[PDB]
């Protein structure tokens, strides 16, 4: 359960400043290791972030067209693994193209999505020789990925909390006529929330509730009474204010999100391939 999970205990951070600190520290430690081992070949932490965002979209695209149909829980677990890995590691040391596939592989194992390795790599749009090479790379990096996750494999995603909130609204909030009208748009917001650092900063339940309430606000529906009365936050107004602040912060994270630009990402990809070819 989330309330005593490893995700809450070790992988939900207090602020974006902490995440930036971890990423900059990873970039700097790779820089120091490379300098000791052996120039402007290094990528900056914001360039690492841009590449990580791009490769997270690529991981999402890989999981979407993956046959057999990969469940949404496996995809969420894989994306969480990717984010957590690149919190403490540099894309210059481990290529995100292979790490993302390794994340999908490990998530398929952890979430009991039974797929054989050959049928896992058959989803790649590459040649059979490239498929075998990719499989060997994935097998090489599986243990590394598990180590960098500190052997914390269960990932709590907002999808089941989202379903539970829909059930609770249908049962206890007649003011909302048909809560299912809120699904699609909330799902949309969910996707957007997933692109940010929110999954490292907020609980799955908070993410789900934020998505639902943003969907309601877009629909114009006010569900302040659901928080106040059904969730009984009128007894602790401080709890209600903290929850509202959390959702406002998440909405701000979504609104400020800067999708990676094609040309900037292409330049960064040339830079990263140069960094991997050298050393």
């Amino acid at each position: 359960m989330y309330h005593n999970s490893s995700q809450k205990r070790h992988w939900t951070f207090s602020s974006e400043e902490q995440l930036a600190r971890l990423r900059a520290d990873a970039n700097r430690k790779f820089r120091c290791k490379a300098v000791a081992n052996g120039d402007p070949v290094f990528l900056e932490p914001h360039e690492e972030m841009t590449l990580c965002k791009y490769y997270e979209k690529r991981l999402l695209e890989f999981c979407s067209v993956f046959k057999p149909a990969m469940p949404r829980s496996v995809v969420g677990t894989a994306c969480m693994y990717f984010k957590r890995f690149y919190l403490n590691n540099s894309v210059m040391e481990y290529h995100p193209r292979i790490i993302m596939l390794t994340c999908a592989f490990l998530a398929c194992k952890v979430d009991e999505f039974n797929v054989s390795s050959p049928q896992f790599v058959g989803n790649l749009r590459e040649s059979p020789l490239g498929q075998e090479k990719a499989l060997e790379q994935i097998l090489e990096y599986e243990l590394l990925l598990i180590q960098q996750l500190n052997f914390h494999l269960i990932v709590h995603n907002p999808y089941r909390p989202f379903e539970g909130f829909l059930i609770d609204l249908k049962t206890r909030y007649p003011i909302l006529e048909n809560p299912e009208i809120l699904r699609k748009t909330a799902d949309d917001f969910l996707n957007r929330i997933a692109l940010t650092d929110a999954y490292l900063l907020y609980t799955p339940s908070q993410i789900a509730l934020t998505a639902i309430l943003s969907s309601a606000s877009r629909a114009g529906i006010t569900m302040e009474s659901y928080l106040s009365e059904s969730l009984m936050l009128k007894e602790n107004r401080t709890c209600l204010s903290q929850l509202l602040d959390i959702m406002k912060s998440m909405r701000n994270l979504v609104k400020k999100y800067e999708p990676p630009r094609s040309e900037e990402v292409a330049v960064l990809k040339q830079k990263l391939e140069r960094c991997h070819s050298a050393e």
């Binding site: 989330y2 089941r160 059930i167 049962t171 789900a208």
Partner: protein
């Protein structure tokens, strides 16, 4: 030293979840798909899915890192 049952006390950091044996009385089960006769024969009831979903929805809702 006689044993006395005490319930497990795990803080969920969220709203109270209604008891498993009350969901049907409260109308929650009207919004989950009914367990098939084979599912019921094996011991799976839709009340299990509803309870898990509500527990996940309310778990850690009030928690702050």
């Amino acid at each position: 030293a006689l044993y006395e049952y005490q319930p497990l006390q795990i803080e969920t950091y969220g709203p109270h979840v209604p008891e498993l044996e009350m969901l049907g009385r409260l109308g929650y089960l009207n919004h989950v798909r009914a367990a098939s006769p084979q599912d019921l024969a094996g011991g799976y009831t839709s009340s299990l899915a509803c309870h898990r979903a509500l527990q996940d929805a309310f778990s850690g809702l009030f928690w702050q890192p």
